Amino acid sequence: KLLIIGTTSRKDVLQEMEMLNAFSTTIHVPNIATGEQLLEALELLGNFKDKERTTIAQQVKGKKVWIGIKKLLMLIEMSLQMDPEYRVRKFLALLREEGASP
Amino acid sequence: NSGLHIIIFDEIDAICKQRGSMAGSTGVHDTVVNQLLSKIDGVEQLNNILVIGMTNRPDLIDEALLRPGRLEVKMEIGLPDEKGRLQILHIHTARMRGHQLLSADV
Amino acid sequence: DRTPLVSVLLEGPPHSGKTALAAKIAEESNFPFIKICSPDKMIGFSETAKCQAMKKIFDDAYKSQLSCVVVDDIERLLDYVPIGPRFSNLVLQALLVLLKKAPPQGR
Ligand SMILES: Nc1ncnc2c1ncn2[C@@H]1O[C@H](COP(=O)(O)OP(=O)(O)OP(=O)(O)O)[C@@H](O)[C@H]1O
């Protein structure tokens, strides 16, 4: 017997190259897209404080959230390096900069 | 009335020129490969030899070497299994048992 | 007696089982000499290797009195791709000349 597992980020080009017709199944991996999900992920990682988490939830309730776990980690790293007072503000600032809209 | 002489090769695929299909360019002039072949047959008729060949890539063997009157028996030696592994360990570990040097725990 | 060569091209949408029907038709001929040139047995080759392999197959086929050769998956064989398009003109020129060559007399 045998089994093969593939991976890519640009399905359209593969479709155009009549290659998808060779594979036998497809799966989707969506990005985080909701605020409550972001709060849950932050909680699981456990890097933000109680009042910190409350302020984040207050500011991010707009629901205009769309990011990739990888980039979330990198942003968290960048943010954490400030002093305790300006960490949340800077993190929210970067988050706002990356205002994607699929 | 002569005895039997056995000559063992190895990776006979090395003396092949039919392996350049995938940019192999590992075939020198077929001359060299012709000569060896014409030592297992020809106008001369040696009758006291046995040649055992060994390889790893069965797909790149020159076809002229797999015909009647030449190397004409193929066989496969697959990976060992549970019983084979047990027997091989028992074989390899007879010394320490023979001298009690092995711990009884194992 | 006045048509020593014949040809036929089977076609159909993907996954309809053309290969199996071709194989069955070839098998039910009772002919003495049959072959199947399948792409799989040339992975990673260079166009020259393909050409030489086909040359050899047809050359051997010439030596009998009756035969049948099943060149399967002609599309892939000619390194196709939609974008471009792209391919190997050599193989095309080869097959096109070969599909018309009559064998020696009386075969
Ligand atoms: N009556 C039948 N007609 C066609 N195919 C059949 C029939 N009965 C069973 N099959 C099965 O259908 C399958 C056809 O596979 P085949 O490779 O011929 O399809 P194909 O269209 O040539 O494939 P591909 O498009 O990938 O080249 C085989 O598994 C064959 O055994």
Side-chain angles (χ1 to χ4, degrees):
Chain A
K1 314 293 172 53
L2 186 60
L3 176 66
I4 305 185
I5 294 164
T7 289
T8 182
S9 293
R10 310 198 65 166
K11 190 199 189 167
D12 56 64
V13 60
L14 308 188
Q15 168 158 89
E16 181 52 294
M17 289 191 152
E18 66 166 29
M19 188 194 46
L20 192 164
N21 209 34
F23 283 81
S24 302
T25 308
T26 309
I27 300 168
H28 183 82
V29 177
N31 282 330
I32 191 169
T34 78
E36 68 281 18
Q37 284 167 351
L38 198 159
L39 276 294
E40 297 161 7
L42 269 165
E43 186 194 62
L44 284 162
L45 208 64
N47 294 115
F48 280 60
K49 313 318 301 166
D50 291 331
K51 313 306 300 201
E52 196 179 10
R53 196 163 287 94
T54 316
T55 312
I56 292 284
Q58 184 67 2
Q59 283 293 75
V60 306
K61 265 145 57 172
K63 195 169 178 300
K64 187 61 139 54
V65 297
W66 171 271
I67 188 162
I69 180 173
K70 180 157 172 175
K71 188 65 92 170
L72 178 57
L73 276 50
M74 151 55 58
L75 273 295
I76 283 170
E77 270 290 352
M78 309 264 297
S79 61
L80 181 54
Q81 293 305 337
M82 285 293 98
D83 304 316
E85 55 274 7
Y86 308 145
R87 280 167 192 189
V88 290
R89 171 144 36 91
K90 182 165 188 58
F91 175 80
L92 294 166
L94 300 146
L95 165 58
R96 187 53 47 74
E97 192 288 332
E98 202 61 16
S101 64
Chain B
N1 309 275
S2 59
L4 276 293
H5 308 241
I6 209 164
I7 302 97
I8 63 177
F9 284 30
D10 205 6
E11 183 178 2
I12 187 172
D13 62 359
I15 58 160
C16 202
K17 67 249 88 145
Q18 310 192 355
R19 68 201 312 95
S21 292
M22 304 190 297
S25 59
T26 313
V28 311
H29 314 301
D30 314 356
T31 310
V32 184
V33 190
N34 300 335
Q35 176 57 47
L36 177 71
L37 189 165
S38 306
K39 268 296 198 317
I40 315 305
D41 64 325
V43 70
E44 70 297 336
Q45 42 280 110
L46 307 177
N47 303 322
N48 63 6
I49 301 95
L50 178 65
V51 181
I52 289 162
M54 302 176 307
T55 178
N56 170 37
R57 267 74 60 71
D59 295 324
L60 297 154
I61 193 66
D62 184 312
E63 294 294 328
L65 273 287
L66 290 306
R67 317 160 62 185
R70 296 184 173 93
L71 285 72
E72 58 177 307
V73 178
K74 59 194 64 43
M75 171 175 198
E76 168 159 24
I77 313 301
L79 298 175
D81 52 23
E82 181 48 61
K83 299 151 290 196
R85 284 194 302 281
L86 163 56
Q87 291 183 19
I88 299 161
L89 311 171
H90 195 308
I91 281 172
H92 278 102
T93 58
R95 179 158 299 285
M96 284 72 74
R97 167 165 38 260
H99 297 171
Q100 292 85 13
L101 297 167
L102 183 61
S103 170
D105 177 13
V106 309
Chain C
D1 64 1
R2 53 168 51 161
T3 309
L5 183 57
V6 181
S7 300
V8 61
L9 172 79
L10 273 286
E11 62 76 26
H15 302 308
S16 173
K18 300 163 276 278
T19 296
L21 285 164
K24 167 63 79 172
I25 285 163
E27 180 175 347
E28 288 193 353
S29 71
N30 305 348
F31 284 21
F33 180 95
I34 311 186
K35 285 296 194 74
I36 306 177
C37 169
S38 44
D40 56 339
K41 324 305 288 190
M42 272 144 279
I43 57 169
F45 279 25
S46 58
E47 69 275 16
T48 182
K50 298 191 182 200
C51 174
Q52 294 310 328
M54 278 194 193
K55 170 57 64 54
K56 198 268 182 176
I57 297 296
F58 270 93
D59 266 16
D60 279 344
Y62 278 110
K63 316 309 294 290
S64 161
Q65 305 310 131
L66 302 168
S67 294
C68 182
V69 181
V70 178
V71 177
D72 195 28
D73 298 10
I74 195 55
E75 193 266 27
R76 180 52 46 214
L77 194 152
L78 292 171
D79 62 359
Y80 199 82
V81 71
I83 289 162
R86 293 180 181 176
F87 52 84
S88 304
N89 207 343
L90 181 71
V91 188
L92 179 53
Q93 290 277 320
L95 274 295
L96 174 43
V97 57
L98 287 169
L99 272 296
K100 293 186 286 185
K101 175 179 165 201
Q105 184 278 341
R107 289 168 180 184

PDB file of all heavy atoms in Angstrom, chain A residues 1-27:
ATOM      1  N   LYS A   1       0.835  -1.191   0.000  1.00  0.00           N
ATOM      2  CA  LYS A   1       0.000   0.000   0.000  1.00  0.00           C
ATOM      3  C   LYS A   1       0.875   1.247   0.000  1.00  0.00           C
ATOM      4  O   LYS A   1       2.101   1.179   0.116  1.00  0.00           O
ATOM      5  CB  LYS A   1      -0.939   0.004   1.213  1.00  0.00           C
ATOM      6  CG  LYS A   1      -1.636  -1.327   1.463  1.00  0.00           C
ATOM      7  CD  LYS A   1      -2.629  -1.657   0.358  1.00  0.00           C
ATOM      8  CE  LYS A   1      -3.176  -3.068   0.503  1.00  0.00           C
ATOM      9  NZ  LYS A   1      -3.732  -3.324   1.860  1.00  0.00           N
ATOM     10  N   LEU A   2       0.224   2.399  -0.133  1.00  0.00           N
ATOM     11  CA  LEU A   2       0.934   3.668  -0.185  1.00  0.00           C
ATOM     12  C   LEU A   2      -0.031   4.784   0.185  1.00  0.00           C
ATOM     13  O   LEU A   2      -1.252   4.613   0.148  1.00  0.00           O
ATOM     14  CB  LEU A   2       1.541   3.912  -1.572  1.00  0.00           C
ATOM     15  CG  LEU A   2       2.441   5.140  -1.742  1.00  0.00           C
ATOM     16  CD1 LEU A   2       3.639   5.066  -0.814  1.00  0.00           C
ATOM     17  CD2 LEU A   2       2.895   5.279  -3.186  1.00  0.00           C
ATOM     18  N   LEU A   3       0.538   5.930   0.545  1.00  0.00           N
ATOM     19  CA  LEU A   3      -0.239   7.126   0.829  1.00  0.00           C
ATOM     20  C   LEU A   3       0.637   8.336   0.553  1.00  0.00           C
ATOM     21  O   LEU A   3       1.838   8.315   0.833  1.00  0.00           O
ATOM     22  CB  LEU A   3      -0.734   7.145   2.280  1.00  0.00           C
ATOM     23  CG  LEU A   3      -1.486   8.405   2.709  1.00  0.00           C
ATOM     24  CD1 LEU A   3      -2.792   8.528   1.944  1.00  0.00           C
ATOM     25  CD2 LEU A   3      -1.740   8.398   4.207  1.00  0.00           C
ATOM     26  N   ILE A   4       0.033   9.386   0.004  1.00  0.00           N
ATOM     27  CA  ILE A   4       0.753  10.598  -0.363  1.00  0.00           C
ATOM     28  C   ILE A   4      -0.028  11.801   0.141  1.00  0.00           C
ATOM     29  O   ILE A   4      -1.254  11.871  -0.012  1.00  0.00           O
ATOM     30  CB  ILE A   4       0.981  10.686  -1.886  1.00  0.00           C
ATOM     31  CG1 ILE A   4       1.682   9.421  -2.383  1.00  0.00           C
ATOM     32  CG2 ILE A   4       1.806  11.918  -2.232  1.00  0.00           C
ATOM     33  CD1 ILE A   4       2.061   9.460  -3.847  1.00  0.00           C
ATOM     34  N   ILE A   5       0.692  12.749   0.734  1.00  0.00           N
ATOM     35  CA  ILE A   5       0.116  13.954   1.315  1.00  0.00           C
ATOM     36  C   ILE A   5       0.836  15.151   0.716  1.00  0.00           C
ATOM     37  O   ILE A   5       2.070  15.221   0.762  1.00  0.00           O
ATOM     38  CB  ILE A   5       0.249  13.965   2.849  1.00  0.00           C
ATOM     39  CG1 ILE A   5      -0.596  12.852   3.471  1.00  0.00           C
ATOM     40  CG2 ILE A   5      -0.156  15.319   3.406  1.00  0.00           C
ATOM     41  CD1 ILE A   5      -0.231  12.539   4.905  1.00  0.00           C
ATOM     42  N   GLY A   6       0.071  16.096   0.162  1.00  0.00           N
ATOM     43  CA  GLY A   6       0.631  17.277  -0.452  1.00  0.00           C
ATOM     44  C   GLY A   6       0.172  18.545   0.250  1.00  0.00           C
ATOM     45  O   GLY A   6      -0.782  18.545   1.039  1.00  0.00           O
ATOM     46  N   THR A   7       0.803  19.652  -0.134  1.00  0.00           N
ATOM     47  CA  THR A   7       0.571  20.928   0.521  1.00  0.00           C
ATOM     48  C   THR A   7       0.998  22.055  -0.406  1.00  0.00           C
ATOM     49  O   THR A   7       1.976  21.920  -1.146  1.00  0.00           O
ATOM     50  CB  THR A   7       1.336  21.006   1.846  1.00  0.00           C
ATOM     51  OG1 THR A   7       0.737  20.122   2.801  1.00  0.00           O
ATOM     52  CG2 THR A   7       1.341  22.423   2.386  1.00  0.00           C
ATOM     53  N   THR A   8       0.264  23.161  -0.351  1.00  0.00           N
ATOM     54  CA  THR A   8       0.529  24.313  -1.201  1.00  0.00           C
ATOM     55  C   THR A   8      -0.235  25.501  -0.636  1.00  0.00           C
ATOM     56  O   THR A   8      -1.036  25.363   0.292  1.00  0.00           O
ATOM     57  CB  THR A   8       0.113  24.058  -2.648  1.00  0.00           C
ATOM     58  OG1 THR A   8       0.429  25.206  -3.446  1.00  0.00           O
ATOM     59  CG2 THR A   8      -1.384  23.792  -2.726  1.00  0.00           C
ATOM     60  N   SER A   9       0.017  26.672  -1.219  1.00  0.00           N
ATOM     61  CA  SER A   9      -0.666  27.893  -0.827  1.00  0.00           C
ATOM     62  C   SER A   9      -1.408  28.565  -1.972  1.00  0.00           C
ATOM     63  O   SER A   9      -2.160  29.513  -1.722  1.00  0.00           O
ATOM     64  CB  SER A   9       0.333  28.896  -0.230  1.00  0.00           C
ATOM     65  OG  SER A   9       0.859  28.424   0.998  1.00  0.00           O
ATOM     66  N   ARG A  10      -1.222  28.110  -3.210  1.00  0.00           N
ATOM     67  CA  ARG A  10      -1.807  28.738  -4.394  1.00  0.00           C
ATOM     68  C   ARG A  10      -2.506  27.642  -5.196  1.00  0.00           C
ATOM     69  O   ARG A  10      -1.907  27.020  -6.075  1.00  0.00           O
ATOM     70  CB  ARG A  10      -0.734  29.460  -5.201  1.00  0.00           C
ATOM     71  CG  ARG A  10       0.125  30.390  -4.351  1.00  0.00           C
ATOM     72  CD  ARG A  10       0.882  31.406  -5.188  1.00  0.00           C
ATOM     73  NE  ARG A  10      -0.005  32.341  -5.869  1.00  0.00           N
ATOM     74  CZ  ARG A  10       0.393  33.472  -6.434  1.00  0.00           C
ATOM     75  NH1 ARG A  10       1.664  33.845  -6.417  1.00  0.00           N
ATOM     76  NH2 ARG A  10      -0.504  34.251  -7.031  1.00  0.00           N
ATOM     77  N   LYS A  11      -3.780  27.404  -4.877  1.00  0.00           N
ATOM     78  CA  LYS A  11      -4.522  26.327  -5.527  1.00  0.00           C
ATOM     79  C   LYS A  11      -4.883  26.667  -6.967  1.00  0.00           C
ATOM     80  O   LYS A  11      -4.966  25.765  -7.810  1.00  0.00           O
ATOM     81  CB  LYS A  11      -5.785  26.013  -4.726  1.00  0.00           C
ATOM     82  CG  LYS A  11      -6.519  24.755  -5.167  1.00  0.00           C
ATOM     83  CD  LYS A  11      -7.955  24.756  -4.665  1.00  0.00           C
ATOM     84  CE  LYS A  11      -8.633  23.416  -4.900  1.00  0.00           C
ATOM     85  NZ  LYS A  11      -9.918  23.295  -4.156  1.00  0.00           N
ATOM     86  N   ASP A  12      -5.116  27.945  -7.267  1.00  0.00           N
ATOM     87  CA  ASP A  12      -5.589  28.318  -8.598  1.00  0.00           C
ATOM     88  C   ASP A  12      -4.585  27.924  -9.675  1.00  0.00           C
ATOM     89  O   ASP A  12      -4.957  27.363 -10.713  1.00  0.00           O
ATOM     90  CB  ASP A  12      -5.869  29.820  -8.644  1.00  0.00           C
ATOM     91  CG  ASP A  12      -4.663  30.649  -8.253  1.00  0.00           C
ATOM     92  OD1 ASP A  12      -3.645  30.597  -8.974  1.00  0.00           O
ATOM     93  OD2 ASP A  12      -4.732  31.351  -7.223  1.00  0.00           O
ATOM     94  N   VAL A  13      -3.301  28.206  -9.446  1.00  0.00           N
ATOM     95  CA  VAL A  13      -2.289  27.872 -10.444  1.00  0.00           C
ATOM     96  C   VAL A  13      -2.247  26.367 -10.664  1.00  0.00           C
ATOM     97  O   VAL A  13      -2.165  25.893 -11.804  1.00  0.00           O
ATOM     98  CB  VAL A  13      -0.915  28.431 -10.027  1.00  0.00           C
ATOM     99  CG1 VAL A  13      -0.469  27.845  -8.699  1.00  0.00           C
ATOM    100  CG2 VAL A  13       0.123  28.161 -11.106  1.00  0.00           C
ATOM    101  N   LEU A  14      -2.309  25.590  -9.582  1.00  0.00           N
ATOM    102  CA  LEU A  14      -2.301  24.137  -9.722  1.00  0.00           C
ATOM    103  C   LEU A  14      -3.509  23.663 -10.518  1.00  0.00           C
ATOM    104  O   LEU A  14      -3.393  22.772 -11.368  1.00  0.00           O
ATOM    105  CB  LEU A  14      -2.275  23.481  -8.344  1.00  0.00           C
ATOM    106  CG  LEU A  14      -1.177  23.967  -7.398  1.00  0.00           C
ATOM    107  CD1 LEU A  14      -1.151  23.111  -6.148  1.00  0.00           C
ATOM    108  CD2 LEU A  14       0.185  23.970  -8.077  1.00  0.00           C
ATOM    109  N   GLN A  15      -4.680  24.246 -10.255  1.00  0.00           N
ATOM    110  CA  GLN A  15      -5.862  23.925 -11.046  1.00  0.00           C
ATOM    111  C   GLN A  15      -5.626  24.209 -12.522  1.00  0.00           C
ATOM    112  O   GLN A  15      -5.991  23.403 -13.385  1.00  0.00           O
ATOM    113  CB  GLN A  15      -7.064  24.719 -10.533  1.00  0.00           C
ATOM    114  CG  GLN A  15      -8.270  24.693 -11.458  1.00  0.00           C
ATOM    115  CD  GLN A  15      -9.567  24.993 -10.732  1.00  0.00           C
ATOM    116  OE1 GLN A  15      -9.969  26.150 -10.610  1.00  0.00           O
ATOM    117  NE2 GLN A  15     -10.231  23.949 -10.254  1.00  0.00           N
ATOM    118  N   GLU A  16      -5.011  25.351 -12.831  1.00  0.00           N
ATOM    119  CA  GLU A  16      -4.767  25.696 -14.227  1.00  0.00           C
ATOM    120  C   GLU A  16      -3.843  24.690 -14.901  1.00  0.00           C
ATOM    121  O   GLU A  16      -3.987  24.422 -16.098  1.00  0.00           O
ATOM    122  CB  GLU A  16      -4.180  27.105 -14.323  1.00  0.00           C
ATOM    123  CG  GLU A  16      -3.912  27.594 -15.745  1.00  0.00           C
ATOM    124  CD  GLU A  16      -5.116  27.462 -16.662  1.00  0.00           C
ATOM    125  OE1 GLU A  16      -5.527  26.320 -16.955  1.00  0.00           O
ATOM    126  OE2 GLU A  16      -5.653  28.504 -17.092  1.00  0.00           O
ATOM    127  N   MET A  17      -2.898  24.118 -14.156  1.00  0.00           N
ATOM    128  CA  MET A  17      -1.952  23.158 -14.710  1.00  0.00           C
ATOM    129  C   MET A  17      -2.507  21.738 -14.760  1.00  0.00           C
ATOM    130  O   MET A  17      -1.723  20.785 -14.846  1.00  0.00           O
ATOM    131  CB  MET A  17      -0.655  23.175 -13.897  1.00  0.00           C
ATOM    132  CG  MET A  17       0.180  24.428 -14.085  1.00  0.00           C
ATOM    133  SD  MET A  17       1.826  24.262 -13.367  1.00  0.00           S
ATOM    134  CE  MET A  17       2.771  25.374 -14.405  1.00  0.00           C
ATOM    135  N   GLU A  18      -3.831  21.579 -14.700  1.00  0.00           N
ATOM    136  CA  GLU A  18      -4.485  20.270 -14.782  1.00  0.00           C
ATOM    137  C   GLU A  18      -3.827  19.240 -13.868  1.00  0.00           C
ATOM    138  O   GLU A  18      -3.881  18.035 -14.129  1.00  0.00           O
ATOM    139  CB  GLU A  18      -4.518  19.758 -16.226  1.00  0.00           C
ATOM    140  CG  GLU A  18      -3.159  19.435 -16.832  1.00  0.00           C
ATOM    141  CD  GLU A  18      -3.272  18.631 -18.110  1.00  0.00           C
ATOM    142  OE1 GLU A  18      -4.292  18.775 -18.816  1.00  0.00           O
ATOM    143  OE2 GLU A  18      -2.343  17.852 -18.407  1.00  0.00           O
ATOM    144  N   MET A  19      -3.193  19.697 -12.789  1.00  0.00           N
ATOM    145  CA  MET A  19      -2.574  18.777 -11.843  1.00  0.00           C
ATOM    146  C   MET A  19      -3.549  18.328 -10.762  1.00  0.00           C
ATOM    147  O   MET A  19      -3.494  17.175 -10.321  1.00  0.00           O
ATOM    148  CB  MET A  19      -1.344  19.422 -11.200  1.00  0.00           C
ATOM    149  CG  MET A  19      -0.531  18.458 -10.336  1.00  0.00           C
ATOM    150  SD  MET A  19       0.680  19.225  -9.236  1.00  0.00           S
ATOM    151  CE  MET A  19      -0.264  20.553  -8.498  1.00  0.00           C
ATOM    152  N   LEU A  20      -4.445  19.218 -10.328  1.00  0.00           N
ATOM    153  CA  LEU A  20      -5.418  18.851  -9.303  1.00  0.00           C
ATOM    154  C   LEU A  20      -6.213  17.619  -9.708  1.00  0.00           C
ATOM    155  O   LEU A  20      -6.594  16.814  -8.851  1.00  0.00           O
ATOM    156  CB  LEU A  20      -6.358  20.030  -9.034  1.00  0.00           C
ATOM    157  CG  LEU A  20      -7.270  19.946  -7.805  1.00  0.00           C
ATOM    158  CD1 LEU A  20      -7.825  21.321  -7.474  1.00  0.00           C
ATOM    159  CD2 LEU A  20      -8.410  18.955  -8.004  1.00  0.00           C
ATOM    160  N   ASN A  21      -6.463  17.447 -11.007  1.00  0.00           N
ATOM    161  CA  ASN A  21      -7.190  16.274 -11.473  1.00  0.00           C
ATOM    162  C   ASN A  21      -6.469  14.979 -11.130  1.00  0.00           C
ATOM    163  O   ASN A  21      -7.100  13.917 -11.114  1.00  0.00           O
ATOM    164  CB  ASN A  21      -7.408  16.361 -12.984  1.00  0.00           C
ATOM    165  CG  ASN A  21      -8.664  15.644 -13.435  1.00  0.00           C
ATOM    166  OD1 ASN A  21      -9.669  15.622 -12.725  1.00  0.00           O
ATOM    167  ND2 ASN A  21      -8.613  15.055 -14.622  1.00  0.00           N
ATOM    168  N   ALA A  22      -5.164  15.039 -10.859  1.00  0.00           N
ATOM    169  CA  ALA A  22      -4.433  13.834 -10.487  1.00  0.00           C
ATOM    170  C   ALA A  22      -4.696  13.443  -9.037  1.00  0.00           C
ATOM    171  O   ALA A  22      -4.887  12.259  -8.739  1.00  0.00           O
ATOM    172  CB  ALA A  22      -2.936  14.038 -10.718  1.00  0.00           C
ATOM    173  N   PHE A  23      -4.714  14.414  -8.127  1.00  0.00           N
ATOM    174  CA  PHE A  23      -4.999  14.114  -6.734  1.00  0.00           C
ATOM    175  C   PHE A  23      -6.413  13.546  -6.601  1.00  0.00           C
ATOM    176  O   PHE A  23      -7.211  13.563  -7.540  1.00  0.00           O
ATOM    177  CB  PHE A  23      -4.832  15.364  -5.873  1.00  0.00           C
ATOM    178  CG  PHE A  23      -3.399  15.706  -5.577  1.00  0.00           C
ATOM    179  CD1 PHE A  23      -2.628  16.388  -6.503  1.00  0.00           C
ATOM    180  CD2 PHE A  23      -2.819  15.334  -4.377  1.00  0.00           C
ATOM    181  CE1 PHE A  23      -1.310  16.700  -6.233  1.00  0.00           C
ATOM    182  CE2 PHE A  23      -1.501  15.645  -4.103  1.00  0.00           C
ATOM    183  CZ  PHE A  23      -0.746  16.327  -5.033  1.00  0.00           C
ATOM    184  N   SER A  24      -6.719  13.034  -5.407  1.00  0.00           N
ATOM    185  CA  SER A  24      -7.978  12.345  -5.170  1.00  0.00           C
ATOM    186  C   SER A  24      -8.845  12.981  -4.095  1.00  0.00           C
ATOM    187  O   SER A  24      -9.995  12.559  -3.928  1.00  0.00           O
ATOM    188  CB  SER A  24      -7.716  10.880  -4.786  1.00  0.00           C
ATOM    189  OG  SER A  24      -6.984  10.215  -5.800  1.00  0.00           O
ATOM    190  N   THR A  25      -8.343  13.973  -3.364  1.00  0.00           N
ATOM    191  CA  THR A  25      -9.124  14.606  -2.310  1.00  0.00           C
ATOM    192  C   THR A  25      -8.503  15.957  -1.999  1.00  0.00           C
ATOM    193  O   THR A  25      -7.347  16.221  -2.339  1.00  0.00           O
ATOM    194  CB  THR A  25      -9.186  13.728  -1.053  1.00  0.00           C
ATOM    195  OG1 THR A  25      -9.617  12.408  -1.408  1.00  0.00           O
ATOM    196  CG2 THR A  25     -10.156  14.308  -0.033  1.00  0.00           C
ATOM    197  N   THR A  26      -9.287  16.814  -1.349  1.00  0.00           N
ATOM    198  CA  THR A  26      -8.848  18.151  -0.982  1.00  0.00           C
ATOM    199  C   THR A  26      -9.247  18.447   0.456  1.00  0.00           C
ATOM    200  O   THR A  26     -10.228  17.904   0.969  1.00  0.00           O
ATOM    201  CB  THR A  26      -9.459  19.210  -1.913  1.00  0.00           C
ATOM    202  OG1 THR A  26      -9.233  18.839  -3.279  1.00  0.00           O
ATOM    203  CG2 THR A  26      -8.854  20.582  -1.651  1.00  0.00           C
ATOM    204  N   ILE A  27      -8.468  19.312   1.106  1.00  0.00           N
ATOM    205  CA  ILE A  27      -8.790  19.779   2.448  1.00  0.00           C
ATOM    206  C   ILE A  27      -8.440  21.258   2.545  1.00  0.00           C
ATOM    207  O   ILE A  27      -7.509  21.741   1.892  1.00  0.00           O
ATOM    208  CB  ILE A  27      -8.054  18.970   3.541  1.00  0.00           C
ATOM    209  CG1 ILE A  27      -8.444  17.492   3.473  1.00  0.00           C
ATOM    210  CG2 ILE A  27      -8.357  19.541   4.920  1.00  0.00           C
ATOM    211  CD1 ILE A  27      -7.566  16.584   4.308  1.00  0.00           C
TER     212      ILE A  27
END
